[PDB]
Amino acid sequence: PHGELQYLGQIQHILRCGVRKDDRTGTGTLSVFGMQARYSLRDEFPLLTTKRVFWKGVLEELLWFIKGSTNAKELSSKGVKDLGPVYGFQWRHFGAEYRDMESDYSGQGVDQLQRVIDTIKTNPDDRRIIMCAWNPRDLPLMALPPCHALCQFCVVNSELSCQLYQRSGDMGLGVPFNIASYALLTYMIAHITGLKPGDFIHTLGDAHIYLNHIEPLKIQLQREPRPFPKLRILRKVEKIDDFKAEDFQIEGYNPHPTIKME
Template sequence: MSTSEQAYLQLLRDVLQNGVRKDDRTGTGTISTFGYQMRFPLSEGFPLLTTKRVPFKLVASELLWFIKGDTNIRNLLQHNNNIWNEWAFKRWVESEDYSGPDMTNFGLRSQTDTAFAKQYMEQMNLFKERILADSDFAAAYGELGDVYGKQWRDWKKAQGGSIDQLKDVISSIKNNPDSRRLIVTAWNPEDVPSMALPPCHTMFQFYVSEGKLSCQLYQRSGDIFLGIPFNIASYALLTHLIAHECGLGVGDFVHTLGDAHIYSNHMEQIEIQLSRDPKPLPKLLLNTDKQSVFDFEMEDLSLEAYDPHPTIKAPVAV
C-alpha cells in the first residue's frame, strides 16, 4: 500500500482527533493543528490522491501558470481552470465599477441561500465571460496582484531590477548541487497587502543526494481537504520537471505545514474519503523532448494508470 496516500489520510485523522477549534478569516470555522510534516517518496509513484479524484489538468495548468510568472486568471480560464476565480471575483464585486446585485460574503451565503446561489453563479459566469472576451477588463480585474508567479520569476529588488528565483535555483542545482541555499520564497512582506491571497505555500528548498532531487515545502496555511492534495501534486510535479532538466532522478517531496486545518463544512466529505481504500498511485509521463522547465506546455504532461475513487465536492472558503 502506498505510504504517500497513507501520510495524507493520517493527517486527516490526526487533525480530526487532536485539532483545536478556531475561528478564521472566512468566518467558516475550522479544526486546526500547528506544525505537521509528511514525506512522499516519489519513486513510489506520482502522489495524486486515489481516495478521491484530484484533477491533474488543474494541478498542472496552475503550476505552469506559476512557472511562466503569470498572475492573471485569464490564462487559467483559457485552460478551463477555475481554481482562482473567487479571489479575482471578490476584487471585482468590491470595486467601485461593480453595479450588480450585492455579493457580500458570497462564499458563505451561496451555501445556505438557494436563490442567492443562483444569482451568484450568474454573476460569476458573466465575470468569467468578460475576462475571456475583454482584455482591458481582464487586465483590471483578472489580476491577482504579486502572487506566486511574480515572486518566483520577478522578485523586485530594493535597488531596482528583479531576481528570477526559479531560474537561479535551477542553475544552482546544476552547478552547485550540494548548496544549502537552493531556496525559492513567495513570501514578500512588502507585496502581501497587494495580493488577492497572500502565499499559503511560502517557501521551498531543494536537496540533491545520490543523483536524486528532493524538495521540501513550508506551507504557512493549508486547507487539508481541498487545498493540500493540490499542493502535494503540484510540488511533486515541479520536482519532477526540475529533476528532468537537471539530469537527476527524483527523491522525496517533504511537506511541512504551519496551520493545517479542516473547515467545518468539509466534515461529511472527509468521512466519505476516510471510508475508502487507497488504490495504486499513477505514473507521471513527461515529454522528454522538452529539456527546459520553462518550455513545458499542458500537452507535454500526462498520467498513466490513474484510477481514483469518484470526486467529492466541497465548498471553497474565500
C-alpha cells in the same frame, strides 16, 4: 505502506484532536500545529486516489505560475476556472516593482526558479536551494512581511528532493492539490537538471480542516488508497519555460469518485 496513508492519518488526527478555531473568514476550522509527510517520487506520482484530484488544473496552474503571469484570463481560457503580484510573478521576478499584467519584466527582480535550477547545476551539495512565496495581501500590510511558503530542494546522489514549508494548509481542498503541484514541479526540475525525482516532503505550521468539510472527509477516510499512478514526460525538454501541457502524461490513475468541497 502507501504514501496516501499519511494524508488520511493526518485528516483523522485533526478530526479527533483538532482545536476549534476561527480564521480570517467567519468559517470555523479544526486546527493542529506542525505536520510533516514524505511522498516518494521514485517510479510513482503522489496524485491522491481516495478522491479524484483535478490533474488538468494542477498542470495548467503550475505552467501558468512558471511563465510568471499575473493574469486570470491566461488560466481561465485553458478551462480551470489582473491578479496582482501572485506566486508566479514572485517566482520569476522576486522583488521587482509590480506595474500592470502586461508590462515588460524581462530580467527584472530575482528569478528564483532559474536560480534554483542554476544552483542544482553548479553546486548540488548547496543547502540554500530555496524559493519563497508571499501571500500578496500581506505585502502592503507591514514592512518586511513573512513569506507564506518556501521550497527547499536537495540533491542526493542523482535524486532531486523538495521540501515545501507552508505556514498554513487547508487539509481538505488545498493540500491534495499542492502535493500534486509541488511533486510536479520537482519532476520538471529533475528532468531539466538530469536528475531523477526523489521525495516530496510536505510540512505545515497551521494544518486546518474547514467545518463544512468534516462530513465529506469522514467519508473519504473509509476509502482504501489505490496504487499511485506514474507521470511520464514525453519529450526531452531543456528549459523550464519550454514545458507545455502535452509533454505530460499521467498513466494508471485509478481514483475513487470526486468529492465536492465548498
